[PDB]
Amino acid sequence: TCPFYKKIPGTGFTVDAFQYGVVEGCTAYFLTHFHSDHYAGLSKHFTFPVYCSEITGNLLKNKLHVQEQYIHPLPLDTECIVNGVKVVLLDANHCPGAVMILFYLPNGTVILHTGDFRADPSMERSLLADQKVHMLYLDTTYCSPEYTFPSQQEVIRFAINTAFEAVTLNPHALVVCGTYSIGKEKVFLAIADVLGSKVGMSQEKYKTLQCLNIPEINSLITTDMCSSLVHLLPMMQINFKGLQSHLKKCGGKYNQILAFRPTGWTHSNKFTRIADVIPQTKGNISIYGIPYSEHSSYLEMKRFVQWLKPQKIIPTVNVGTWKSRSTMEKYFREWKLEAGY
Numbered sequence: 001t002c003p004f005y006k007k008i009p010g011t012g013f014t015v016d017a018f019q020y021g022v023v024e025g026c027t028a029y030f031l032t033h034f035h036s037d038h039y040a041g042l043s044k045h046f047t048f049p050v051y052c053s054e055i056t057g058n059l060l061k062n063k064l065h066v067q068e069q070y071i072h073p074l075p076l077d078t079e080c081i082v083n084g085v086k087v088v089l090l091d092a093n094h095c096p097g098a099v100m101i102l103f104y105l106p107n108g109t110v111i112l113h114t115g116d117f118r119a120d121p122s123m124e125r126s127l128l129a130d131q132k133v134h135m136l137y138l139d140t141t142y143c144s145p146e147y148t149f150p151s152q153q154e155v156i157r158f159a160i161n162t163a164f165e166a167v168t169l170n171p172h173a174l175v176v177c178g179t180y181s182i183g184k185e186k187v188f189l190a191i192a193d194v195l196g197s198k199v200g201m202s203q204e205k206y207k208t209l210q211c212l213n214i215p216e217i218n219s220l221i222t223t224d225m226c227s228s229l230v231h232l233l234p235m236m237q238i239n240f241k242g243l244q245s246h247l248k249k250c251g252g253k254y255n256q257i258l259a260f261r262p263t264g265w266t267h268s269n270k271f272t273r274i275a276d277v278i279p280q281t282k283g284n285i286s287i288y289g290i291p292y293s294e295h296s297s298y299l300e301m302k303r304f305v306q307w308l309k310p311q312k313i314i315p316t317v318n319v320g321t322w323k324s325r326s327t328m329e330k331y332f333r334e335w336k337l338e339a340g341y
């Protein structure tokens with residue numbers, strides 16, 4: 001059955017709760033973003049109302065084939081009414097179309113659900129600042145002090161300079177970026193822009209990108225692999241064997257590959273800075289690991305929560321074991337004692 005952390009008290013609303021069949025009492029199902037864990041169970045066979053951003057609605061319509069009658073897209077930063085209750089969708093700074101939801105309950109309680117988010121100080125000057133938030137449903141993916149990572153902009157700068165140098169040294173080098181879902185598009189778009197190229201990709205991936213309301217998108221991406229010097233492949237193919245194999249397929253138009261694997265955190269965040277990063281190399285193929293994160297680091301998460309000062313925190317990630325929950329509760333109490341709420 002639907003866990004309590006996916007239910008919004010004193011409404012018949014749920015959030016990211018599509019895998020439990022019909023939820024008893026639920027009149028509106030919210031979807032924060034189009035990542036398979038959160039949408040799990042949604043298909044063309046679903047027949048209840050789904051509330052979401054416009055981008056998330058495009059994806060539901062075109063990729064999952066959910067019938068149009070059940071998709072209720074809402075604009076961002078706008079007070080809207082859903083089944084008699086005031087809501088606001090906010091940018092979550094996660095992947096394209098990802099939202100946080102602010103719920104103003106009839107009794108006067110205010111609840112923020114973050115979805116998946118990368119906390120940022122620009123969130124301290126949104127509609128959130130206008131009133132007290134009593135309960136927070138929090139993306140706790142990286143809720144432990146070891147999880148540090150650079151800014152998105154540091155990582156992009158590094159990727160840009162690396163790619164430009166390599167293709168100026170060898171104009172027959174191909175650049176490859178690994179991918180498995182939406183998110184982290186700035187990586188391949190910024191590399192292509194510095195090389196004066198479109199991004200080449202499969203038909204299914206192009207169809208996904210064509211849903212995301214990216215300005216001038218038709219000038220940036222193509223299905224003609226031949227005509228482009230940046231290619232997207234599945235993350236699973238970003239290894240020496242998969243990359244040599246792809247290079248054979250391109251028809252000797254290229255004689256070298258430089259590849260990037262955007263990952264989350266991995267244990268080499270604890271020593272290295274982004275400027276020290278060096279690739280793994282085998283012959284004419286080099287693979288760079290770059291920690292481009294779309295989740296809050298420990299410090300960004302802590303800052304956001306200490307500003308917000310919620311009366312109760314409800315974790316939404318790593319809640320499956322008591323050890324994890326216990327560990328998280330310890331950090332929440334520390335934050336509260338330091339900040340005086």
Ligand code: NI
Nearest residue numbers: 033035094116
């Ligand atoms: Ni996500």
